Design a protein around this ligand. Sequence first.
Ligand SMILES: C[C@@H]1CN(C(=O)c2cnsn2)[C@H](C)CO1
Ligand SMILES: C[C@@H]1CN(C(=O)c2cnsn2)[C@H](C)CO1
Lengths: 264, 263
Amino acid sequence: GSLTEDGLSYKEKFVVRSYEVGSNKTATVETIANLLQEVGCNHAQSVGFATTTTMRKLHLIWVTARMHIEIYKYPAWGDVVEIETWCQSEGRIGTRRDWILKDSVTGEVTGRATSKWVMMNQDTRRLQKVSDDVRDEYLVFCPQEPRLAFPEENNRSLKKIPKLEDPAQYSMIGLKPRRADLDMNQHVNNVTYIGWVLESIPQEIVDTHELQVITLDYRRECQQDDVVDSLTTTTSNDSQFLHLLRLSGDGQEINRGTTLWRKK
Amino acid sequence: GSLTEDGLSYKEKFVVRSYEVGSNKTATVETIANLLQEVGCNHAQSVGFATTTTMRKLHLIWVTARMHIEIYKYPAWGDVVEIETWCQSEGRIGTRRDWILKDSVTGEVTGRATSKWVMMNQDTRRLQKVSDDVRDEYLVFCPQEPRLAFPEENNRSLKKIPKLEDPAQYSMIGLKPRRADLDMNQHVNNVTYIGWVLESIPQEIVDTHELQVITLDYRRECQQDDVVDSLTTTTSDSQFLHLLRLSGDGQEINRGTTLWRKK
Ligand SMILES: C[C@@H]1CN(C(=O)c2cnsn2)[C@H](C)CO1
Ligand SMILES: C[C@@H]1CN(C(=O)c2cnsn2)[C@H](C)CO1
């Protein structure tokens, strides 16, 4: 865990653990997503923090609107992965955080991710634009010239996601979080939703295909004592799926997303 | 990390991660339990592996019968924790693996664990005594004179556990495993049962106390498409008796006990 020489970014190395890998003895997307949110956390600390002076006064926090992860090589059990991360202002809309995943050995890129964070009141739960007093407090910790994990003119990162229409092709019912799914402030961990989305995927897809891309929009949080239904429908070599999570009660939307898989 | 000088134990340092800690910003017992599994594997790697040359020719695997963990201080988010592990045969009654947890900075003991492993046929799931062929192959990687994280005669770690009787005081029902709960061979991993056991403890207890001790017997494996009920009754510091059982037929998978101190 260290800031680069210009200290506008942060690199960290992780060894992939026995309990972090799947049936292929390569890291699960959930382990990856956990490494991302861990390196993101160590970057905040390293620059003095990401609740600011003005944000703590006004009881506001960063929440995640969208995550987007693209993987080429899932690192093997006992392989070292290097993750460089950094953050940039979207002027008034909120902040973006980007990641690159590299093989420690070859130095070749095996993954990249981008997230969209927006400002929210802790107590009332109501979103709002970024006050310039807040912008100016973290602008001095970001590259000023743009630096995009997903630069391409037509990238799948900013692509608009439909609501799944009943009936769903596939579903996983009655999903609840346990204490291991809670973060340190007792909210459901953003990685759990990834896992809940993937529960509706048929085992045969997972067994024969590799997850290449996942886009996940975040609408409402799941509470400790809520219950989630996970709905999936094919939309397609490569397989694409449309995903919806909702409360099994009123059918209130909490998440929507798409995933893209290739044959092994 | 590395084998100690004598190559009869293994040590590893772990930095506690943001997503590995609970509401008081110290490691959960499940993170601890996962660190024990991880260092356990890195020890087997290091001495050349378990599944010995026979265990494979015979289709035999090591299976957890007992897990015993006692925590004095849960390491804080950002702290380094050194864990030393080592093995030792319990005659034809399987093998024992023990752990010591130290604070890196002070070298002070913050927790200790012991686990009972027994050989079964993976295809038939048939429990059997450890043969002499398997014995000679894996005694060279163990201390010969005994070395116990829990040496004290008639201690917590060997105390026979009763079956909870209905009605239970507390119950979390309908618990199912997701793919994150599967190890690399598609079996529910030994750490998930811990979480399932602890889910029946009242939140107010978790909020006012710290788990000092947990003992867990492993009767039968829960399968990907099984459903578990988690039952708890106060027996008392606070003490509880635990039963995990299949939602339908009511078949037992685990029993256990937990001891909690006030903060
Ligand atoms: C340089 C860092 C980046 N950062 C975050 O930690 C973050 C990213 N996700 S939401 N907010 C702050 C906005 C500023 O300090
Ligand atoms: C150093 C090795 C470790 N080991 C194991 O992997 C094991 C068995 N189940 S628990 N510990 C061998 C069987 C014995 O000695």
